[PDB]
């Protein structure tokens, strides 16, 4: 009826004060959690660098204690996951997506200490994983905890506070409030029905958790005749997005064969992967890590074309292994790394081929940063605003879109699925079937 619309239109954007205020506490706790996590990852990563000083002269021993420290922290991580919270392996983002569909439980009393001390091990182990995973999952749970702790009722209360937690989490993981908001109202939220997620509360929670992050952690241009080059980048990003999704899902299966569910086969498998990272963290330190390290070095062009081909392959290999194996840790930040490295590499070719454009590989590096998100995750808008939050190069805002849409078109037409949805569907299907 037209009569209900009028009633609805006039009563629009009135969120209850008790939910708004609780969004403020959620945000304050998520940002705190997020920071503590971050600090602990840094501390451990460091201790490990300090071990390679006390064994600096003996090179075989050096390479041994590079493997063992990480393998021990990974193993300690997988153990917390398998023994206490199997829901808290992998990213965590899909497991919250479900909780918003009301299809997956939010076991905060379990996931919080697991995901936190688990990722602390795997990330501190120097694995190729993000902070987004642990912070988004924890975020949602921190929102779920204060729902239950104040036994607040209603669908608005439950989705709003479960969304502001998840958004506040990402904001902290990238010092990026806007990306948090857009991530909620683009990828996270229930995609096929209406929901009562209050965006104002999401605004509050994001603000608080960014402030908490701030308290303890304080390119050229692109003319028209150059635009088609960003389309192409995107196309190439779109053909490879599904391929990457298929490998990560493929590799999910091909590693379940190695341990068949067995807690001790799994932990030991993790141990050898986590150890492989600690090792590559020394002998080849760009092939390991969550991948942030090399975004500014690649945006310049201090890397050569040879080294770029090398990193991209190695990082793909090592992103799959760490994530496909179901370690606690994201794939979001490593996709920014992969996105940059490839975009850089394209920009370098583009520079030498078309001198009449007077290119800078660094624009293609910035266009390509949030492109693999657009193709694998199918959340282009967030990756564009995240990367525009971090680097803002405005003159690039059109190139950055064209590339994103290009990859989002070719992710569809080449038979790719959104990567978080594909994992949730896997998890609902494995559960039912």
């Amino acid at each position: 009826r037209r009569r209900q619309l009028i009633r609805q239109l006039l009563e629009r954007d009135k969120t209850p004060l008790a939910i708004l205020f609780m969004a403020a506490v959620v945000g304050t706790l998520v940002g705190l959690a997020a920071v503590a996590f971050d600090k602990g990852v840094a501390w451990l990563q460091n201790q490990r660098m300090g071990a390679l000083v006390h064994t600096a002269d003996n090179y075989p021993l050096l390479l041994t204690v590079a493997f063992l420290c990480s393998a021990v922290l990974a193993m300690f991580g997988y153990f917390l996951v398998r023994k206490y919270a199997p829901e808290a392996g992998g990213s965590g983002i899909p497991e919250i997506e479900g909780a918003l569909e009301d299809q997956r439980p939010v076991r905060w009393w379990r996931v919080l200490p697991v995901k936190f001390f688990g990722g602390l091990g795997t990330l501190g182990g120097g694995m190729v994983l993000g902070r987004e995973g642990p912070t988004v999952q924890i975020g949602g749970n921190i929102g779920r905890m204060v729902l239950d702790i104040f036994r607040l009722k209603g669908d608005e209360a439950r989705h709003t506070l479960l969304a502001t937690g998840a958004a506040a989490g990402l904001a902290a993981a990238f010092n990026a409030p806007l990306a948090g908001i857009l991530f909620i109202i683009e990828e996270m939220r229930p995609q096929f029905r209406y929901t009562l997620i209050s965006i104002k509360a999401v605004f509050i929670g994001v603000i608080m958790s960014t402030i908490m992050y701030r308290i303890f952690n304080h390119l050229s241009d692109a003319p028209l005749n150059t635009l088609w080059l960003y389309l192409i980048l995107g196309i190439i990003f779109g053909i490879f997005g599904p391929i990457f999704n298929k490998w990560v899902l493929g590799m999910q299966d091909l590693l379940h064969r190695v341990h068949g569910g067995n807690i001790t086969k799994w932990v030991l498998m993790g141990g050898a992967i986590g150890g492989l990272c600690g090792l590559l963290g020394f002998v080849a330190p760009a092939t390991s890590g969550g991948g942030f390290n090399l975004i500014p070095i690649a945006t310049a062009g201090n890397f050569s074309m040879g080294m770029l081909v090398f990193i991209f392959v190695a990082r793909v290999i090592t992103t799959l292994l760490c994530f496909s194996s179901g370690a606690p840790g994201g794939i979001f930040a490593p996709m920014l790394a992969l996105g940059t490295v490839l975009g850089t590499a394209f920009g370098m070719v583009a520079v030498e081929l078309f001198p009449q454009y007077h290119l800078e590989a660094g624009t293609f590096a910035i266009a390509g940063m949030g492109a693999l998100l657009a193709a694998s995750i199918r959340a282009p808008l967030t990756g564009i605003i995240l990367v525009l939050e971090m680097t803002c190069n405005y003159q690039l805002i059109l190139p950055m879109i064209i590339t994103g849409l290009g990859a989002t078109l070719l992710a569809q037409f080449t038979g790719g699925k959104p990567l978080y949805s594909a994992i949730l569907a896997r998890t609902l299907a494995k559960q039912e079937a």
Partner: antibody
Amino acid sequence: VRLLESGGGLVQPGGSLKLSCAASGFDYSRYWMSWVRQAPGKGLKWIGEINPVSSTINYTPSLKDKFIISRDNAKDTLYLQISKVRSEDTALYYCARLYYGYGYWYFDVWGAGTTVTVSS
Amino acid sequence: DIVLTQSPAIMSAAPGDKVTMTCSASSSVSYIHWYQQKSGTSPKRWIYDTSKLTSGVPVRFSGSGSGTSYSLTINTMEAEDAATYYCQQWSSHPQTFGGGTKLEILR
């Protein structure tokens, strides 16, 4: 905007000299700079160009180190060294700022030039 | 690398007359540029991207072309329009200029 090149004058065949173009009026970074020479009563001929970070420096098909372009964002100046100077380098040497419209690049603003002469 | 040939090397017309020169490329070009060089002073940018005027150029001046043929045109020439006009492309690399057309007053 004003480009004011110095350095010209008389040199002997075989010798080598360094012309200078001193930029004022604008932010000297953010701009590609470029040299173009004009031999007596004849055409404009492009010599080379240089991006702001000096990470890209192209020349017209020349002999290796005939021409070395370089810039100084601190001093706000564009340099051009020439070597093996022979009579074909006797010309009026314009420096110039580069920009564009659709992205087919033009020579935006030119200096008055400096004359070089190669005579024994 | 693109050779631009400008048709009349020298020409003349009396102030008030419709003047039109030509820039003809060896291979194909797109979006060319025109410069006005008076004796003793710097070449000034005049017309760019084939037909856009430079902020300052009077509207009597205009440009048009495609393929391998373009043309600067002066609908009603003035006294001050006598000069040397060089066409230049950078659709291909390296960029190139024409030999120029010298436009002179007819009295």
